[PDB]
């Protein structure tokens, strides 16, 4: 009956010889080769 | 300010409906609760039974009972009220 | 101009001819071009305008309107170019597109649309705000 409606990029790199101390590592190679040569 | 886009209600009853709708909108958030409040009110004041339907976007066709069928828009929503 | 195009343009022009004097303001020239079914860019519009209102009267007559219309009419994009354009904002060719990327490009690149135009677009297209847009239907509505 009714109806309705309605943050900046940063670049870091590692450089040679920083972390690597050449002397403390090349010591044993020298020791070894010389021991070999001597004893042998 | 407010509107009634269709009505079937005796003036004082219509003013009562309006004041009830105001006090409901005041004391309610959910819709079905506001509908229940308003319908309980009118049914208890204007001789049951009633039915109420509250919404925001809905198309309506019904077969009401004379002088018991009101449609009005308040605040956000539109409210339809009609007695069985 | 053919009889059909003349009629169409008279119809639209009189719709936009605020006072019927037989001319239209440059401000709604774009509307008319768009109103006639052409999707020209704001750059071409500004060029045509510049390239036509030297006199400074700020009006356009039917003859010049018909010349501009035939010119712009010659270069009309097809439906596939548009589909492709939509898919360009469809990262993975799934047929959907994030709403945030779409809005960001639409409002940040090219001929930056207005916020009103983006809002209207989203509204008028009935697209689900937190979904994936089946750009094929949105495009059909917009085609």
């Amino acid at each position: 009956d009714t109806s309705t409606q309605t943050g900046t990029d940063a670049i870091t790199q590692i450089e040679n010889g920083d972390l690597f101390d050449f002397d403390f590592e090349v010591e044993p190679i020298l020791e070894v080769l010389v021991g070999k040569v001597l004893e042998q | 300010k407010a509107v009634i886009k269709n009505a079937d209600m005796s003036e004082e009853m219509q003013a009562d409906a309006v004041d009830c709708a105001t006090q409901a909108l005041e004391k309610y958030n959910i819709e079905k609760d506001i509908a229940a409040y308003i319908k309980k009110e009118f049914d208890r004041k204007h001789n049951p039974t009633w039915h109420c339907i509250v919404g925001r976007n809905f198309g309506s066709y019904v077969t009401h009972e004379t002088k018991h069928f009101i449609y009005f828009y308040l605040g956000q929503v539109a409210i339809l009220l009609f007695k069985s | 101009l053919t009889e059909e195009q003349i009629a169409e343009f008279k119809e639209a022009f009189a719709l936009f001819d605020k006072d019927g004097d037989g001319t239209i303001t440059t401000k709604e020239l774009g509307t008319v071009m768009r109103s006639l079914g052409q999707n020209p860019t704001e750059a071409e519009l500004q060029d045509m305008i510049s390239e036509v209102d030297a006199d400074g009267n700020g009006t356009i007559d039917f003859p010049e309107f018909l010349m501009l219309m035939a010119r712009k009419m010659k270069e009309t994009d097809h439906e596939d170019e548009l589909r492709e354009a939509f898919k360009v904002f469809d990262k993975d060719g799934n047929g959907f597109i994030s709403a945030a990327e779409l809005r960001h490009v639409m409002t940040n690149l090219g001929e930056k649309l207005s916020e009103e135009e983006v809002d209207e677009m989203i509204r008028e297209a009935d697209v689900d705000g937190d979904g994936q847009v089946n750009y094929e239907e949105f495009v059909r509505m917009m085609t």
Binding site: - | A35 | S35, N39, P40, G110
Partner: protein
Amino acid sequence: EADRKLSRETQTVKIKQHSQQTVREQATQMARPGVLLDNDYDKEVTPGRYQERDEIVLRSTLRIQRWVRGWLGRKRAAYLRGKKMEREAFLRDQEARAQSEAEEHRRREIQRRMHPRTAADFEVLYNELEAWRLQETRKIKEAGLAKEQEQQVLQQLLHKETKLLQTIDRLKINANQENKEARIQHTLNEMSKHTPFTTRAKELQQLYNGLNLPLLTVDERLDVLLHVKWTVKEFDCDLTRELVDLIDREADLLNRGRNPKMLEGLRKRISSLFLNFIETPEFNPEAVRF
């Protein structure tokens, strides 16, 4: 005595779907000769071209902006067309209704011209005729001729005038009769708008519109005459005598059998005497109205 039982309620509302995600991790292990070793479940690849996609998307945005401008113009044009057609319907239908009302007034005037029911309609006709006479004689005078046949033209004109005036008189008689009948119906109506006297009045109105009835028969006619006679026989003074007398004359001369087409004046007299019976205070306890 009864009462209601229960009810139900459903809050129709929008309900969408939203997605939530979680962090996914991957491990990469650099491969070098030594302790490092690894099972191969890997894949190899060729690079291909790399993106310069920005200029492509910029051109795409320009194209889509052109397209959206055309579409927005088209939608504004569609709304303008809608309002245009709305206003055109408005104007056309308004003018059509106006023309219809004008034609209705024209037809009403033509009906007034056919029969002048109103007294004012008759005054209008009279003044119109006198204007016609004056215009006729003005043309005849400005003719300025026939100093011996002017009078014959005048006689023809006067005979026309006399004929028209007699027709006006006839129409006035007809209108007076029909106005009389109408005002009688109106009084009968005022005798209807539930007091017992008013109920009897409604009954008598039904009776009077049964008396003034055409398309009678004989059994139904005799029956309704019997009904109305029973009804009349309550007050029974002296008018009821003659009304019943004419009714019984018809009843008899119908029992013997005579063409009801020959029963015109008698039906008229019966109806008149019954209305006069109705037009009586004691006989119709409402006649105080008039």
